[PDB]
PDB file of C-alpha atoms and ligand atoms in Angstrom:
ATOM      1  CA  UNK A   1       0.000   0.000   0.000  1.00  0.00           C
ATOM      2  CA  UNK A   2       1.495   3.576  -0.825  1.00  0.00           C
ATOM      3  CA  UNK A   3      -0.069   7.104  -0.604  1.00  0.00           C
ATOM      4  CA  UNK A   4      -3.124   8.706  -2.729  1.00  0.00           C
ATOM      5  CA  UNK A   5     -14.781 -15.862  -4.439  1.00  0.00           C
ATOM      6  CA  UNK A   6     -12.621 -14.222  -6.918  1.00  0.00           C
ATOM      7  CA  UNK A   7     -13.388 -11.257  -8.881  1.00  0.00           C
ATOM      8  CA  UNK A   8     -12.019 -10.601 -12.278  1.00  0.00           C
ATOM      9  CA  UNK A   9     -10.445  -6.804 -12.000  1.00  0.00           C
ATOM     10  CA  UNK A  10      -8.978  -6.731 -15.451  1.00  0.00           C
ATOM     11  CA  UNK A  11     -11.199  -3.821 -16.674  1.00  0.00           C
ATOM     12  CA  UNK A  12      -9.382  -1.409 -14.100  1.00  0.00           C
ATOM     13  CA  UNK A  13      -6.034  -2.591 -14.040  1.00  0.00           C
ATOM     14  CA  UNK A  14      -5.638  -3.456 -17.560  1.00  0.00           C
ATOM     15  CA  UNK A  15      -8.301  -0.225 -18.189  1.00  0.00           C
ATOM     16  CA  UNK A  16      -6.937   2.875 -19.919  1.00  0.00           C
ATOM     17  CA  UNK A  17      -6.557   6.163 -16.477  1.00  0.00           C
ATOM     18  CA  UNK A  18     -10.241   7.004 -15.567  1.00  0.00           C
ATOM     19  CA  UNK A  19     -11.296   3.320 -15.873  1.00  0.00           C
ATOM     20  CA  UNK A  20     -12.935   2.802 -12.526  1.00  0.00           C
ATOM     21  CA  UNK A  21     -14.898  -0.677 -10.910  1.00  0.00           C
ATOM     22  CA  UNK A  22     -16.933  -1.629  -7.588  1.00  0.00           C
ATOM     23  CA  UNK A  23     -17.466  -4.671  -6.083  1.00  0.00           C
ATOM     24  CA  UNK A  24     -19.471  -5.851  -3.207  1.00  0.00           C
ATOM     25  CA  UNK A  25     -17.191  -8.905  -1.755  1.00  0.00           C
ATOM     26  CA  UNK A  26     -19.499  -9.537   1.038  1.00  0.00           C
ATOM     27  CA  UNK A  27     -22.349  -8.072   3.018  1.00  0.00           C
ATOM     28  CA  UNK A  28     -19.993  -5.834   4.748  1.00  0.00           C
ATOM     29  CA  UNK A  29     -16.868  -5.093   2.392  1.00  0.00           C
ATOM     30  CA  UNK A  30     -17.201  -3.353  -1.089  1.00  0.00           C
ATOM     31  CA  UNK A  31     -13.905  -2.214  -2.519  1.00  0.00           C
ATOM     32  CA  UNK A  32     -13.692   0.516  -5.063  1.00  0.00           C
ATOM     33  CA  UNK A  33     -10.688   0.445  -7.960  1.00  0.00           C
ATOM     34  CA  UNK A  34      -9.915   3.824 -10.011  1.00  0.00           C
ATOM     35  CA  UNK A  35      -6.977   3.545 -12.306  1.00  0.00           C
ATOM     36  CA  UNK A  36      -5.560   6.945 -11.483  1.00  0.00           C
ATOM     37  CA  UNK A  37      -2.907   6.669 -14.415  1.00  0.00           C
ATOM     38  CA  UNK A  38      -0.796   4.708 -16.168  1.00  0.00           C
ATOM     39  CA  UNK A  39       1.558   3.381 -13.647  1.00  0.00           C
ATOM     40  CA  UNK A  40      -1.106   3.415 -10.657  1.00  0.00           C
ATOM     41  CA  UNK A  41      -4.150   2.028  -8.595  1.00  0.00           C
ATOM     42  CA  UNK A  42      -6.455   3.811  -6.347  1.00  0.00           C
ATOM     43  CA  UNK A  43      -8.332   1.162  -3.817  1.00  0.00           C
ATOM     44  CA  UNK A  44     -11.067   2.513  -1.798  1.00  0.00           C
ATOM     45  CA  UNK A  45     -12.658   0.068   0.602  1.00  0.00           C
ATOM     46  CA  UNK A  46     -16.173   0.442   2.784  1.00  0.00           C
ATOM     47  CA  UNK A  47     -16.218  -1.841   5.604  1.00  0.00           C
ATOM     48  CA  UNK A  48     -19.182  -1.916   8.015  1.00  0.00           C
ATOM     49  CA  UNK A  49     -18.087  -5.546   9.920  1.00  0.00           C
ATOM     50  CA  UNK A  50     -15.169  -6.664  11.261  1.00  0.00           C
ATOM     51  CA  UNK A  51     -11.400  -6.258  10.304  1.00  0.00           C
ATOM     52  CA  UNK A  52     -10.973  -8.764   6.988  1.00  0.00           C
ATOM     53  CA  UNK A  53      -8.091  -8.670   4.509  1.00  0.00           C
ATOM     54  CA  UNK A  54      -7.888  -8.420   0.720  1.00  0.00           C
ATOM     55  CA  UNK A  55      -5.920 -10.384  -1.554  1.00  0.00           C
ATOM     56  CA  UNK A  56      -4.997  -9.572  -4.891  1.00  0.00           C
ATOM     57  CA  UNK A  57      -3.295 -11.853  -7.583  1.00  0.00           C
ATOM     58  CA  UNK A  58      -2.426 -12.739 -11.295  1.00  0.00           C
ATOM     59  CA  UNK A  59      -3.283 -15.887 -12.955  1.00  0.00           C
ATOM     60  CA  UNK A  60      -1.882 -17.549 -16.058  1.00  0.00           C
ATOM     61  CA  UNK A  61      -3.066 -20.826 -17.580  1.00  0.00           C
ATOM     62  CA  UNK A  62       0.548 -22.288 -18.549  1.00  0.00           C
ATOM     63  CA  UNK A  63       1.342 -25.687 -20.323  1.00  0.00           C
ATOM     64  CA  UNK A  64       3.495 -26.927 -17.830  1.00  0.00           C
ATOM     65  CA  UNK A  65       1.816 -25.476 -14.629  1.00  0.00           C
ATOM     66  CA  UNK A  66      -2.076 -24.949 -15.754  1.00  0.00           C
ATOM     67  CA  UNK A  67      -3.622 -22.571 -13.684  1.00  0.00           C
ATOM     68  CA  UNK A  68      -1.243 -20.986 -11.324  1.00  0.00           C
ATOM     69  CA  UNK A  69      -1.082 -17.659 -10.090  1.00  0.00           C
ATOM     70  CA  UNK A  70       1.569 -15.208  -8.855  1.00  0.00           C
ATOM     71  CA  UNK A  71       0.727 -13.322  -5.568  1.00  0.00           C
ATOM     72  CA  UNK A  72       0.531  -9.399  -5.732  1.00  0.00           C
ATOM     73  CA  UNK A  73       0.085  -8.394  -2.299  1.00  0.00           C
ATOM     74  CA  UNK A  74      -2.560  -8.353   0.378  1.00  0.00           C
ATOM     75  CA  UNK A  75      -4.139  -6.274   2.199  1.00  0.00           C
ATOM     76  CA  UNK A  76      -5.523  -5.473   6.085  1.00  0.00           C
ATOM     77  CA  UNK A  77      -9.231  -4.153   5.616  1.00  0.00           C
ATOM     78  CA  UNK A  78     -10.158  -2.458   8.762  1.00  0.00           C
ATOM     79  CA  UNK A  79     -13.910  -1.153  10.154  1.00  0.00           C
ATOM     80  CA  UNK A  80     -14.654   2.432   8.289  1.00  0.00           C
ATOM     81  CA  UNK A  81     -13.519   3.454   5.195  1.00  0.00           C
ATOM     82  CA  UNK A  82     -10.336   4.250   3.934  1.00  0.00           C
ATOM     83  CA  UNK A  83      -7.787   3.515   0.385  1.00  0.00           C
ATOM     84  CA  UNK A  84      -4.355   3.207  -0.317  1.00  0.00           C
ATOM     85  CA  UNK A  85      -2.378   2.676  -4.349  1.00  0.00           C
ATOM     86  CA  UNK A  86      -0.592   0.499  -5.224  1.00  0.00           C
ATOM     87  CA  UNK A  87       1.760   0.089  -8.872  1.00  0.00           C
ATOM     88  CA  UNK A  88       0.666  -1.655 -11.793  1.00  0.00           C
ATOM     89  CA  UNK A  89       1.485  -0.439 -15.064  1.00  0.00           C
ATOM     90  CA  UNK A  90      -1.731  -0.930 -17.210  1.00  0.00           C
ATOM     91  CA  UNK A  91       0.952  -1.969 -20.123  1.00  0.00           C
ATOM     92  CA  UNK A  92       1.576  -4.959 -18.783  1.00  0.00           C
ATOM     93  CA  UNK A  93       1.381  -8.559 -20.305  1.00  0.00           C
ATOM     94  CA  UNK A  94       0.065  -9.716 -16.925  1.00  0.00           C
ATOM     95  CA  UNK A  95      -3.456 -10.661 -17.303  1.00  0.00           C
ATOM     96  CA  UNK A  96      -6.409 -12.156 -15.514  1.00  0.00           C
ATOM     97  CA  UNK A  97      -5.974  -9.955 -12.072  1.00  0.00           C
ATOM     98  CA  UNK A  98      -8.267 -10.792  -9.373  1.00  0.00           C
ATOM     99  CA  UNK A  99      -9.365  -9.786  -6.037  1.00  0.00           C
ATOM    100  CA  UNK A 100     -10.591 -11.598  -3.192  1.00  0.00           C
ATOM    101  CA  UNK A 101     -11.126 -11.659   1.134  1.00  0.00           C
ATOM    102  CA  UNK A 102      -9.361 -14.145   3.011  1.00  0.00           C
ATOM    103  CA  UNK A 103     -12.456 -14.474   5.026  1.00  0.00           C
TER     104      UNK A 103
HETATM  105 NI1   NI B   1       4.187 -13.867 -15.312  1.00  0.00          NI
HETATM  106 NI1   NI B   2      -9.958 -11.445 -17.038  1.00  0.00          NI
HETATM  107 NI1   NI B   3     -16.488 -12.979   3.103  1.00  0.00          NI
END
């Protein structure tokens, strides 16, 4: 974090700056993505339950692996509401990005 199941996120961090998302995880978490340019991430998360955590990560479908993915970071999700960026150039060849709560 730096200073301002699984969903598929791929239309905000592959998404050109302005491209913005919002996704209700649960009955008490919905996170918020804004690509703010090209080289960053704006989170914003509403929590009205207890602290939970949010994982993000970036799956390939490989011939030797299958479906594997590499781990971005994660993420503590405390009560209120809050938002941190983090950096992911939009030109990347890393697709399939998805978010998720570890509980
Ligand atoms: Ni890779
Ligand atoms: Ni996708
Ligand atoms: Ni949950």
């Amino acid at each position: 974090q730096g200073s301002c199941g699984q969903v598929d996120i791929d239309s905000v961090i592959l998404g050109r700056p302005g491209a913005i998302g919002s996704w209700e995880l649960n009955n008490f978490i919905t996170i918020g993505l804004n690509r703010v340019n090209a080289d960053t991430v704006r989170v914003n998360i509403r929590n009205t339950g207890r602290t939970n955590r949010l994982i993000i990560t970036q799956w390939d479908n490989t011939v030797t692996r299958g479906d594997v993915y590499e781990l971005f970071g994660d993420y503590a999700l405390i009560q209120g509401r809050g938002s941190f960026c983090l950096n992911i150039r939009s030109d990347t060849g890393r697709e399939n990005w998805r978010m998720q709560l570890e509980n």
